[PDB]
Design a protein around this ligand. Structure first.
Ligand SMILES: Nc1ncnc2c1ncn2[C@@H]1O[C@H](COP(=O)(O)OP(=O)(O)O)[C@@H](O)[C@H]1O
Ligand SMILES: [Ca+2]
Lengths: 375, 68, 464, 68
């Protein structure tokens, strides 16, 4: 546009595909990372079904679709279907050719080595990308919120990651990975829903569970005191008319499921709560470096949007943590797009040149170019 | 009479849509504020304890100073 | 040009008088008193003279680059902003000042308080106002039109006088923004005639949704103080840039000739060379403009003209000419560069100006034309300053400002709520969407400044 | 068809009143909560000011103690 040339920003997860044009502050066309076929055989003739039904077109009509998700936190059940997800991204919504503008993707911390080389194969050899990089999830948001000294816990629907990044990344481990977010809460509901004459059976309607979840479901401050309150039918049940037509008086259902977050013992996992793992990462660093970590805590992700998420942390942390200085948690009121706001940062930096992979660089160091320069 | 009823029905549904829309925005406004009120209430109670603790520790420090 | 051109037309010798009477006119707009030089204008103007089919002027348009838009609210002690403002406050009657919403008390305001100076013995205030009116009336701005314009300016003054206080919303030491001096922020919404509260719900708090359709404003984020004062400035400063452009352009609408068309010729005019015993951020950007002016000649009187040697068919042999000094150009364009690393440090929100300095030394201190107190042992350089070479001398800059002085970018999440109103003043601040300058609206500063400087170059490598 | 039109007019006119009624009650509930929310917000801030003072006084006493 008579400014520069070849530039773009993108970001994908287990919820939405955040992307936009060149030099933007906020996304432009986010869409669900879904994709399925036809369990209904799509009037076979009222088109040769194909196109699994990805994008707004897919999210619109769920019934015909057997929504089979490709990338469940880390593991990619299949790469063949990924081919026609990015074919919908750059060409339909972004309206730009990938054989021109760079690309800034996100990296699920500690992702299988074999996956990186596989992805690069899809871009460089097929979609011809002469410049691109895959930054590491959390570290991005750090520079956006305006923090240089804090501990980041960025996670939404993908995977939980405790990234103590306030003066260095890639160093002692002090990081954790937990497959317990988003889809885990989306699949657990139908189970407990059975006791209330409800059952979102198939995957298509399972996706709706998440929709209603993010508009009412809240977290209990103390399950004990709210157990006796159950008698008082006022703060619990609330009339929610299902778009089709079937009221669901969610009440105790709201604060029962989220309890699993702090208590992973409800789904057969010894994984400690997100406030225990926090200790595990802090106890590794030096002794004279905790007082500043407690001062500011970066809690990001769409998972940190439900009522009663930050106040609970300040109750459990103080217990098994030093009690002398003040403790404050920085949870950006809109901390979901924290990664994208940070993506816009690195997207406009020139120092970033010493990170991405140039067309020729791949052929000069084989497929291992990724893990030979990056880390 | 049918034509007259149809005319009244057309404007009736229009007013109905407007009424429901106003109620939908009103119930939402009351909802979000109610949630904020609860968040403020919890923040008020937790600080109410800190305030007392901050006062007692001050009085204790004074008594401690009187002894020495 | 004239005489050699043509004559006859009685409307030709008359317009030859108004353009000569434009000297006192141009001596008010562009010119502003500095600490040292009195007639030290400060702007990047490129005036275009249009002509007719016989060879005489008909009109013209005006173009300006990125404005030193901080001049209105912030400046060095002793200096002053544009004259047109101060000459208005002391030229009108208290009766009219009340209509504007002004009170007889300079310290009461903020923008004027930050300076700490109003009445000056040298310049006469009441005597200039009547002269300004003549200038406006002589051109084509009757009192009826003047009043219509003052409402727009008076509106900005209301939205200007609001440096919000500490908002005890947080818990520990940090804080957000909230109004304590309500009548001031109320004045901002007074001219707008909208819910005073609702106004601050969309501004101080950043709302974003988007996806599928396009955006839904209501849920938002109480930003920190740095980003708070940032939007405060970006807002109060952008409105003036749009105003000036619309001010000079809408004036031409009356002056411009409709009787006939013709070609176009451009003319350049810029600030002057000033050097204090001290320096600051503003000195860097001004000197940067000169770096282009020097490069301009090099690209023209040294390069373009040199190509004319072989075009005229002359036995020419390449003679050694001093390098194209690309050490000061390549160092600030392609990846790994000054302005390239400048945008790198600025976007690291937490990183202050002090830390930015260290980001330069490590990347360079080897490429010619850059030194410091660490490498170059020279006591003249302070512990919080740095050395930079230009043409033939040395200049040591300060670090004060930079941050809020540079970025200044303004997003469309603060404009949408305002341009949705129904008033020739409110929406008037935002002319009929995109005055031939948009393409893509939301871009983090850095690039935005490049446009003002790139649009300048692109139109130089294609003309005589 | 007239019977159907009249039938729809009845349920529409009734639902219209209910929608308007709910809009008023929802707004009514919004107002009473909004007022309390503002009162709490104000009260909370006043305590925070006292909280700081209480701490500074407590610390001052400690520093004054160390001297003695
Ligand atoms: N305000 C909100 N309240 C509750 N859930 C939200 C909110 N905003 C976004 N979400 C949810 O957060 C998820 C996306 O979070 P994100 O951190 O981007 O996930 P991922 O990185 O795993 O793709 C989606 O399930 C979305 O519905
Ligand atoms: Ca992810």
């Amino acid at each position: 546009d008579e400014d520069e040339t070849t530039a773009l920003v993108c970001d994908n997860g287990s919820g939405l595909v955040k992307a936009g044009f060149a030099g933007d502050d906020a996304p432009r066309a986010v869409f669900p990372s879904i994709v399925g076929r036809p369990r209904h055989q799509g009037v076979m003739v009222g088109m040769g079904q194909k196109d699994s039904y990805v994008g707004d077109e897919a999210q619109s009509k769920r019934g015909i679709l057997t929504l089979k998700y490709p990338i469940e936190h880390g593991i990619i059940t299949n790469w063949d279907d990924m081919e026609k997800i990015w074919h919908h991204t750059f060409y339909n919504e972004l309206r730009v050719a990938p054989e021109e503008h760079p690309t800034l993707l996100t990296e699920a911390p500690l992702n299988p080595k074999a996956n990186r080389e596989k992805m690069t194969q899809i871009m460089f050899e097929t979609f011809n990308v002469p410049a691109m990089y895959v930054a590491i999830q959390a570290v991005l948001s750090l520079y956006a919120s305006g923090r240089t000294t804090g501990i980041v816990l960025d996670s939404g629907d993908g995977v939980t990651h405790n990234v103590p990044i306030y003066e260095g990344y890639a160093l002692p481990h002090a990081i954790m990975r937990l497959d317990l977010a988003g889809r885990d809460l989306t699949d657990y509901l139908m189970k407990i829903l059975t006791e209330r004459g409800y059952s979102f059976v198939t995957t298509a309607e399972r996706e709706i569970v998440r929709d209603i979840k993010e508009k009412l479901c809240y977290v209990a401050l103390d399950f004990e005191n709210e157990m006796a309150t159950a008698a008082s039918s006022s703060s619990l049940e609330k009339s929610y008319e299902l778009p089709d037509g079937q009221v669901i008086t969610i009440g105790n259902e709201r604060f029962r499921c989220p309890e699993t977050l702090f208590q992973p013992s409800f789904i057969g996992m010894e994984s400690a709560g997100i406030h225990e793992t926090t200790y595990n990462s802090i106890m590794k660093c030096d002794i004279d470096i905790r007082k500043d970590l407690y001062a500011n805590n970066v809690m990001s992700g769409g998972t940190t949007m439900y009522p009663g998420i930050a106040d609970r942390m300040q109750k459990e942390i103080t217990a098994l943590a030093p009690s002398t200085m003040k403790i404050k948690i920085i949870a950006p009121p809109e901390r979901k797009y924290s990664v994208w706001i940070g993506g816009s940062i690195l997207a406009s930096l020139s120092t970033f040149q010493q990170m991405w992979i140039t067309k020729q660089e791949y052929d000069e160091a084989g497929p291992s170019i990724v893990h030979r320069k990056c880390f | 009479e049918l034509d007259r009823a149809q005319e009244r029905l057309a404007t009736a549904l229009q007013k109905l849509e407007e009424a429901e829309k106003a109620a939908d925005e009103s119930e939402r406004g009351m909802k979000v504020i109610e949630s904020r009120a609860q968040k403020d209430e919890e923040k008020m109670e937790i600080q109410e304890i800190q305030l007392k603790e901050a006062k007692h520790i001050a009085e204790d420090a004074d008594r401690k100073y009187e002894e020495v | 040009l004239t005489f050699v051109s043509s004559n006859q037309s009685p409307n030709g010798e008359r317009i030859s008088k108004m353009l000569l009477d434009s000297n006192p006119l141009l001596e008010a707009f562009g010119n502003a008193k500095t600490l040292r030089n009195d007639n030290s204008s400060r702007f990047g103007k490129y005036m275009e003279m249009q002509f007719n089919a016989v060879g005489s002027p008909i009109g013209g348009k005006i173009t300006n680059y990125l404005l030193e838009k901080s001049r209105v609210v912030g400046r060095t002690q002793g200096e002053r902003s544009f004259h047109i403002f101060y000459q208005m406050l002391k030229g009108l009657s208290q009766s009219k000042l009340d209509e504007l919403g002004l009170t007889p008390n300079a310290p009461a305001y903020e923008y004027l308080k930050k300076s700490g100076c109003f009445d000056v013995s040298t310049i006469d205030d009441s005597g200039e106002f009547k002269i300004i009116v003549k200038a406006m009336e002589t051109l084509g701005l009757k009192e009826s039109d003047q009043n219509s314009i003052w409402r727009i300016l008076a509106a900005i003054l209301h939205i200007g006088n609001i440096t919000f206080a500490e908002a005890a919303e947080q818990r520990t030491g940090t804080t957000t923004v909230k109004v304590s001096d309500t009548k001031s922020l109320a004045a901002a919404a007074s001219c707008l005639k909208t819910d005073q509260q609702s106004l601050s719900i969309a501004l101080c708090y950043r709302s974003i949704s988007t996806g599928v359709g396009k955006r839904c404003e209501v849920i938002s984020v109480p930003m920190d103080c740095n980003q708070a004062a940032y939007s405060r400035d970006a807002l109060a400063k952008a409105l003036y840039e749009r105003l000036f452009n619309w001010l000079v352009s809408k004036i031409n609408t009356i002056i411009n000739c409709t009787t006939e068309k013709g070609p176009v010729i451009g003319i350049l005019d810029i600030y002057g060379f000033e050097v204090f015993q001290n320096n600051s951020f503003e000195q860097l950007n001004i000197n940067f403009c000169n770096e282009k002016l020097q490069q301009l000649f090099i690209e023209l009187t040294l390069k373009s003209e040199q190509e004319e040697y072989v075009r005229e068919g002359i036995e020419w042999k390449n003679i050694e000419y001093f390098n194209n000094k690309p050490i000061c150009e390549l160092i600030e364009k392609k990846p790994i560069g000054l302005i390239s690393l400048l945008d790198e440090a600025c976007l690291i929100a937490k990183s202050t100006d002090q830390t930015f300095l260290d980001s330069i030394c490590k990347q360079f201190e080897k490429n010619p034309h850059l030194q410091s107190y660490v490498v170059s042992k020279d006591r003249s350089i302070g512990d919080t300053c740095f050395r930079l070479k230009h043409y033939a001398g040395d200049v040591t800059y300060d670090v004060r400002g930079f941050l809020d002085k540079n970025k200044d970018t303004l997003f469309g999440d603060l404009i949408s709520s305002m341009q949705s109103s129904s008033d020739p003043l409110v929406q008037g601040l935002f002319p009929p969407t995109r005055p031939e300058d948009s393409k893509k609206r939301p871009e983090t500063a850095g690039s935005q400044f490049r446009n003002a400087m790139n649009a300048l170059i692109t139109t130089l490598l294609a003309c005589s």
